[model samples]
Structure formats: structure tokens, C-alpha cells
Target chain A: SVPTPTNVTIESYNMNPIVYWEYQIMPQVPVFTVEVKNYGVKNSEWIDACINISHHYCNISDHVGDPSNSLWVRVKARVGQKESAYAKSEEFAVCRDGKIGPPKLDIRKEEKQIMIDIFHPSVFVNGDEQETTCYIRVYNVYVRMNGSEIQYKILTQKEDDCDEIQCQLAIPVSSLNSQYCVSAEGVLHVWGVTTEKSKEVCITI
Target chain B: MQDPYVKEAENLKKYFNAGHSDVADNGTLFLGILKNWKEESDRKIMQSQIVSFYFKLFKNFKDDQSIQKSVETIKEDMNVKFFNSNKKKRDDFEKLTNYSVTDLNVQRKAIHELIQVMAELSPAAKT
Candidate 1:
């Protein structure tokens, strides 16, 4: 008899949903399959996401719908027509459970100063292969120059601002022609979640 | 003395940001009130005001075309439709009040609904 999968869980980062499970070791390993169901609806049918495969995880990012809607996932083990009972996961809220990814950072040398720009983070929406930029109205920006201590600033959207998606800040460097590095983290204002810090973008002024 | 409406709005904000908060923060508040209905003597009065307040928060995004499209997408894919009732009442600023208890819970879902819709719009933010 094939043992059932256990601890089925859904985790998301930057809106990318991945479902994982663990199986008790058996003499003969069994393939696993996964299914998903919309959580908000009543009596909704479960949809197969992953067929029988020799893996403990499935990437369900593309199958999941809007970030607001909740969903449930389940997994099972199979061995040559002998199938184990399904192990279900807790209800998952994409936006609440999904951690926002890092933002895009750019640095430019402007005479004696370094100009840093912060753009909103990007995410792969449901059923889409290409990544899409998600508007993040605010960020906690970090800057450093010449291996000096870091400077932190909160970037906020001003009403009637021309650039709807980008925030720019100019920092005057004490030593011109030195290296300046900039990185930032986007904030989901209402949710109070901050994304991972972006890769450092460096420029010499 | 802070205005009662303003005070409640702030309280709602704090509740939404609490450590144990979830995506259903607004609904959780309404659900809590429902659970404590008997203990809370002013249930009827408070319920009506909360219903209006939740609508007040949702009113800002109700008219956006992108947001409306996103809502439709969520309905189609997730089968969890929100903001589908009380069209005329939602449109009329004065008619925002006087909703039933069940009506209040339905509208509270808009808190997360608006966030999802706004996330969709960011992809097209480029001018």
C-alpha cells in the first residue's frame, strides 16, 4: 500500500505560489499528485494541477487566481493503481501569505551627487508567463557610499506627482567620484508587509 | 473630543494592522460583532454604522475601470463575487447607511478586493 502525503502547505513569494508536501518513506516509492480548489465558493469542484510525478512539490503559481481570493490545495500518493488518501492544506490568502519580491533599483551619477530611483516590484499573475509590475506606493530606501554607514529614507507618493510608478531621490556625496550603492524595499502600505531588499545598484559620482 | 466616525475609522485601521490580522480584517470585525451580538446591547445601532463605514472605505475605488475589471476577473476565476448588490445605494452617497448585518459582511470583503485590484493596475502604470 502507498503511504499518503502529509503536511501539504502552500507558500508564496512575490505572488508565486508553490505547494509542498512530505511523504513517509516506503519500500517502494510512490508518485504524487496535487489538486486545488477555490476556497471562497461552496461545493466547488477540485481541479488537478499536477499529475502523478515523483516529486514532493508542485509549482501552482500560474494556476492560482487573483491574490485576494483564497484557495485550498491537496496532495495524494500513488503506486501502480494503489492510491493513498488525500492530505489537505490550510486555506491560503495569496496577498496575505505571499511575500512581495524585491523592487527594481537604479543609480545614476549626477555631477557631485548620486541620484537613486525606486520602481515598483514585479510579479507573475495567474495564467501568465511574463512578469508584470505591481504598483508599490512606498518604500524604505537604503543608501551607502564609500563603505560608510547606511542612510535610510522613507519614500512616499505625493498627491498629483507626475511619475506614478517611480520615486527619485538625490543624495549629495561628501566625496565626489566615490562609489555609491543603493538598495530598497517596497512596502504594501495597508498590509504592512515589506518586500525583500533589492540588489544593490552602484554608481560613481 | 474626536468625532465618533473619525475615531471609529482610526480604530478600524488599527484593527486591520494588528498582529493577528488577516486578509479578512474587516469581515472579521463584523463577524466578531455578530458573535457578540447578545452581549453588545447596541448591536443594531453599531451594525448600521459599521456597514456605512465599510462602504465608505470601498467607495473610493468603486468607480475605477481597472478596479472594476479586476473584480470581474476574481469573480470569474475564484467564484467569490463581491460588491454585486445594492448598485443604486452604492452610487448614492446619502444611501450608504441603513444596511443589514449580512449586507455589512459582504461589503467588508472589499478591503482585500481593493488591494487585489490595485495590484492589477500597477502592471499598466506606465504612461
Candidate 2:
């Protein structure tokens, strides 16, 4: 059995890094189990949000209720039969990279378009926020069925990748929303971790 | 696929006697083991001891203002567990509201802790 893995880490919006007590040049345990506690107290089952199986990092960002609440995470290595200890994670918040906030769904639907404007997040690294747009990177927009996030998939790029400074999506009536609550797969990104915020909205069909 | 730890725990059934699986259906086997086993992070061919050990705190108490407050706290949070969006949250929002009692698989720690908290509030465990 593989020895318990050391240096288990997690990546997400506003939480602390999942740093542990040691390091390895190469991680021996290839698979893992990641569990989270919502709102600092509601413990759920362990889930692996990996896109592929490896040491590469992944997040519980795919489905979010608030897109802005803190969650706790703990991980234990998957070694055939040997027992391993669980490394607990601190309260992790998504995209608090620099205390970044959500974009203004600054939305106004048109006959064939869903126009939006997102507020540029003030970027922070180390301890300071960026002074100009230079710190901002590419943007990502994700859209799913109206009022439904009942599925998961690679977030579509949809529009041209713009900076954290703009928005104007020409959508189809078929891409409209119903009165139901959509875990609406609308995603917004910065470099990669800007995070997905689920919103309920009106759209034309 | 099975949680690797579950594989190890499944064998532990023999120690508890034949068909010893009153084990958790909602939590990982690791957590179930965490709840039942007493070895100090080391063992194999272990003995079985099913328990509500963690919930024992409520066993000692009578109904009172203090117990009521703690139960109330758990009651308040109980609504969150019903979140179909989290179960209704951060995956919580979409998944929580998408939650179910049978489906919200928390560790027996959470489960045991909650059962104790809520049980203590009940008249049987109450003064």
C-alpha cells in the first residue's frame, strides 16, 4: 500500500492554500478523495472534482450555491489498502485571491443578444491590489440551459476572450431562460479562477 | 469504484462477527472506522465495537436551557442540509437545494454528532 501522502493541497476562490506539513518531488498517490463542509458546518460526502486523474489541482467550483461562501476541505490519499490520515483544510473561499468580488450581471437583454458588463476585480497578490488593468487577464463566459445547471461540462468560451473590462453576447431565443431557478451555468473567469456565480434571470425565447 | 479505505474496512467485518455491517451507508468507510475503532492510527485485523460514542455527551444531560440552545442551533442548520441547491451551497447552491436526507452522505461524525444534538432535544433524552 502507498504510504500516506504528505503536502495535500487544494485550490479555489477565497480559502487558504491546502498546504500540509511536508513535500515530495513526485506524489506517489495518484488518486485522492476531497470532501467539503459548507458554510463552515454542513459536512457533505467527499467528492473528486478532477477533470482527469492526477496531481493537478481542481475545485468544487463547478456547482456553487452562493459562489461566495466559505467551505472546509479535507483530503486523504487513495492507496489500495493502507490507512492514511486525513489532512484538514482551512476555511476556503473561492476567488478571494485579492478579495475579488462578483461581476455585475450588468445585463440588458436585446432581441437577439444578452448584453452584460462585469466589474473588473481589483487584483491582489502577496498583500497589495493591482493599480491598473495591467493585472487583469482574459475573461470567460459560460451559459447553460435557462434556469438549469442540471448538467456539467467544459464551460464554453462562447464569446471572444476579452479582458476583465467588457461584455456583449449575441444570444439566440433558444438560449433563453424559463421562470425556473437555473443553476444557470453562467461562468466568469480571471486567468482561470474567477469563479462561477449562479443567478436567476429572465431571458427571451 | 470503492473508496480504497472501504476495502480495508470491509475485511474488518469478521472481527465484529459475521455480517457486521450496521456500518454507515451515508459516510465513507474511513469515517465509519473513525467512529468505531479505537486503535491509535495503526491497526489491522481489528476488533469491532459499534457505538454512538461521540454522541455520549447528550447521554449524561437532562433537558435544560443549555440543551435547548444547542438543539436549536442544530435545528437552524438542519434547513441547510435540506438544500436541494446545496444538497441545497457553493456546489451548495446548485447541489444543496438538490439535496436529500438519504443522499446527504456526511461522516458519522457529523451524523452521530447531529443525532446526539437533536436526540438530546427530544423528550426521551431530555429531563
Candidate 3:
């Protein structure tokens, strides 16, 4: 029998739950299969995710119908008729547990105001599509002067991303010859899921 | 194709595996701040952000034993797993939150330490 897949991890990339595993090198190449089950379901059984695929990772964004339901994912390897034991991932939910990447930031030093350009987190367009229910509902923009507490601001967006969600925010700077830091985190309002804050962009006026 | 959000529960799952999962869920916010700190050269500003993030999260369930115990484990792991070559400062949870002029490196260290503990507590890791 082939060895079981190791290091199985499921992380929400963009808004998709993708499972990844490490397989040991064997004499024959092994195809892999993945299964997922919603833990909240009373009698839901293990359901097919990816079948006999050569890729080390499987995208289960489509398997889960609800982004908020907790899901358990597992994978195993197969060579001819022999199959390896299953490796399971911890329970994950796309909305609650998934990690949303921080929005990209571009800061321009305008006359008296700093214009911050915020790009929405990139999302999968095709089979691995953007999240439907728990979309990046809003963004929390943080602004702080050097040596002071960060102030919070909110920006909103719809579920659809055809045109791409982008924002150009202008912040007025009162002081000169000082530093101002800015960062933003995406928020999924349905589940209170917050992405990591963007890289801190500091500029002097 | 069927819509993914149809007939689903209204809210997100609040608790998982008792205290372990809750801590992990709450800790996700810090992941980004920690990432920013790595490239950040201004120690003073980043440290305050770290402390602020910690205080905000800790306030969510400060009275609960499960969260209290989970945080305790993170602290213990910080000293044992990390800080091998460095000295321990702001070792107490209260001190860290109140945050005096402790070691410059401890805030960053705490975030790194929390990430590892959170990973270990993941459902995938236990199995």
C-alpha cells in the first residue's frame, strides 16, 4: 500500500477552501482523492471533492454550499488498486476560519492630503470563484500619527467583483515634517471574518 | 449551478473544540499585524500595535476560564518553545497588556509564539 498523504492543510485562499498535502515519493506515481463533510450537518456523510487527481492540492470551494458551516476535509493516495490511509484536516469554515489576504495599498502624497489607493483582495474567477455569502463586505481602514493610537474607518463593497472593488481614499494631514501610517483589513460582515491588515504604508509631509 | 449560500445557517460558528478553536479564531486578526512587523524597522510603533491588538482580543473573553487557560498555554509555549537565546520580559499577561517599557523584541516574539500554538491547535494538526 502507498503511504498516506502528510501535512494536509486547508486554508481559505482569497475566499476558497483549498486542501494541500505532502506525498512521499514512490516507485509509481499516485493519484489523489479528496472528501469533505459539513460537521454541522446531522447525518451528512463524506462527500467527493476531487477524484483521482495528480495535483497535491484540491479546491473545495464548490463542495461547500454554505460559507459559514464548519467543514472537515480528508485526502488519501491511490496507485492502481492500492490506496493509502486518509489524512484529515482540522475543521474549517470559509467565512469564519478562512484567512482573507490584506488589500494592496498605494499611497500618493498629494498637496495637503495623502491619497491612498486600496485594491480589493484578489479572488478566483473560474471554478474556484469568489465567496457568495460572506463576501468582503467592508474594509477597516486604520490611520495613525506617529506615537498615537490607530483610528478606525470603514469602507464597503458589494458581493460581485466583475469591475473589481477599488477605492481611492484621501486623508488630510495637518502636520508637516511628521510620519503618518495607514493600513486596512477586509471584513466579511456575515461571519465577522477580518482579513489581515495591509502592509503599513508610511509617508512624510 | 446552485448558489452556495442557500438555506445555510445565519451566523458563523462561535466555538470550536472548546477553548482551543476559539483562541485560534480570535487570533487570526493578529496574523496580518505580525506580517507587517517583520518588515517594519520602527520598533516603537509596531510594538504598540501588537499590544493594542492583544488587548482588543483579550477583552472579548477575559473572564472565561477556557480563554484564560488557552492564553496561559500560549505564554508557557512562548517561554519554552521560543526565547531560547533571549531573556523573558513582560512575562505576565497583565504586564503585557498594560505594557511597560519591556523588551523591544517581546511583542513580535509573542505574535510569532501565538501563531505556532494556534497551528498546533488546528483540527488538522491534532489528527
Candidate 4:
């Protein structure tokens, strides 16, 4: 007997790498589209596809869109008698403007100084606020005085503490003195088990 | 001319006496009578025995003791006598009647037939 054909589809949209500027950037939102196809003998039937926006190292959510870090959006298709046979689309990325607040710390202060008050942001599951901690990573930390890049380094944290949980990190002001302003720009990645990935938020201080 | 009934009666009495004789020397006489009567009395006795035995046999077919010995004897004798008869008949009857050697219903019908035949052949035997 001829087996039924299956096709996997993915409709992913990038929702990370938020573009942050000292002033308002008109094109704050980066729009991305993902296409799904069946590369198997059968076409996947009646499957739902979703886009996840995640921070550099955090899990994905529907609301949080940052543009400084990498956002992992998974386009998945489910079908077939067994889920193993289902096809999944590759993860895609999109950038969003991460101008949450005005830039804060000076780039020429000390080698390690409190840049911003890192507050524990609310995490969401499928759109509902969840009381869960998410792992956050600082990726692509760049010190930009005005618009020029300075000292940059990638930082990864082992623990997950990005829920309604607060975490503090010190960025060297010297890391920003070499930039256009005494400001530092960095990407934060948040992740959790239930959450896909959080949008990468670009911070300028 | 000798009356057949008288001759038959005399032959029967001779056979009875020879068979029941106490003298050892009379064994020859018994044997001689048996051989001479083989064609007539022997056949009659054998047929009557068969019919009578069949009635008794069917009647007590279920009776282990009564029918067991008689059934074995009849089957053995049948081998020597009616060799051409179907062996399956008695076996089938035994099975059908549940090994009942003498069933009252079967005995009644067989006895009635035997009596009618015997009476028809010999008026004196009617009573």
C-alpha cells in the first residue's frame, strides 16, 4: 500500500535584535516572514504555525520584542500518525526597536559600574503572564559614544533569573568611552523551558 | 407315509436327549445327531437363537452384565455363521441403543415378529 505523503510547514517571524537609538528611529519594527513547505511524499494537513520572539538567551514569547540580540522563532508543522514524522521549519530571526528607556550609564566611568537597574520583567506563556524565571545572556555588548562602536564582548549566564525576578550586572564605563558618546549598547537574550526565546533588547547607555 | 410333525418331534426329542445325555459314550451319538440335524434343526435353532437373542440382547443392551457376555458370544458366533452380514449392524445397534442389550420396546416388536413367523410355520407352535 502506498503511504500518505507528508509536508512540514513553518511560518516564522523574527522579533528580536531591537534597533535602539538615542533618538526615535522611524522604522522601529523589523518585519520578517517565513514560508513552510512539504519536502516529503505527503503534504502536512491541517497544521498551525506560530512565530516566537525571544531575547538572546531567553525563551520566546508573544509580546516581548527586542532587537539587539538573537531571537529564536521556531516555525513548526505537526502531522502524520506519529509526531516523529512531522516536519518542522527552521528557526528565523527578526529585529525590533529596543528603546525601552533613555540611555543611562556613562561609557567612561569605571571598568565595572552599574549601567542600568535591571528589573525582573514579567514573563509570558502563549501570551498569559507566567511566574517563571528565564535565563538571560548578554550578547554583542558594544559601547557607542554617539553612533560608533567601542569595546564589545559576549557574556553568558548559567542561571535563569529573568522572570518577575530582578538581576543586576555591571558594564565597564570604559567599555563605552571609546564610542561616539559615553553610552554602551548591548543585547540581552532571555530563555525558559516553556518559553521559546525572548527578543534581544538593544540598550544604549 | 410318515407325518412331518411326528418326524420333527422325534428328531427334536433325539437331539434333546443326546445333548443332555449323561453317558460319555453317547457323545458320539450327540455328535451324529448334530451333524444329521445340521441342515434343518441346526438352522432353525440358530435362526431362533439369533432372533430370541436379538430380543434379549436389545432388551438388556444397557445392562452391562446381561448383554456383555451375550453380545460377545453373538458377535463371535456371527463370525462363524453369518460371515457376510455387516459387522457394523450390531455395533451400530449397540451404539444407537446405548449398549442396551435388551430394550423392552425393541424386544416387544422382535418377539411379536418371531412369534408370528414361528406360528405361521408350525400351527402347534402358535400357542
Best by TM-score: 1
In model 1, which runs have C-alpha deviations exceeding 4 angstroms? A111-113, A124-135, A146-156, A159-165, A173-178, B1-127
Query: DockQ for each candidate?
Result: 0.08, 0.01, 0.02, 0.00
- Candidate 4 off by > 4 Å: A1-9, A14-114, A117-136, A146-148, A152-156, A159-167, A171-205, B1-127
Candidate 1 interface RMSD to the true structure:
5.1
**Chain A TM-score, candidate 3?**
0.63
Model 1 CAPRI rating: incorrect
Question: Which residue pairs show backbone clashes in model 3?
Answer: A90-B123, A90-B124
Candidate 4 chain A — worst ten consecutive residues by lDDT sum?
A16-25
lDDT score for candidate 3 against the true structure: 0.65
Please identify which of the two predictions, 1 or 2, would achieve the higher lDDT against the true structure.
1
For each candidate in turn, the TM-score is 0.56, 0.27, 0.46, 0.22
Candidate 4 lDDT tens digits, A1-205: 1111123221222222221111112333222222222212144443222322111122233323322222232232122222112223232222222222211232223445534333322321124433111223442334344455555433334433222233334555443343333223334333211222223244433
Chain B TM-score, structure 4: 0.26
Is 1 or 3 the stronger prediction by DockQ?
1
Put down candidate 3 lDDT per residue, A88-194, tens digits, no spaces.
88777777777777887777787788887777776522345444456666667777775674555554554232135476677777545357777988777556667
Q: Fraction of the real A/B interface contacts present in each candidate?
A: 0.09, 0.00, 0.00, 0.00
Give each prediction's root-mean-square deviation over alpha carbons.
Answer: 16.3, 23.4, 19.3, 41.9
State each model's CA lDDT, in order.
0.66, 0.41, 0.65, 0.34
Q: How close is candidate 3 to the true structure, as a TM-score?
A: 0.46
Collision pairs in model 1: A177-A205
State residue B75's C-alpha deviation in candidate 2, in Å.
23
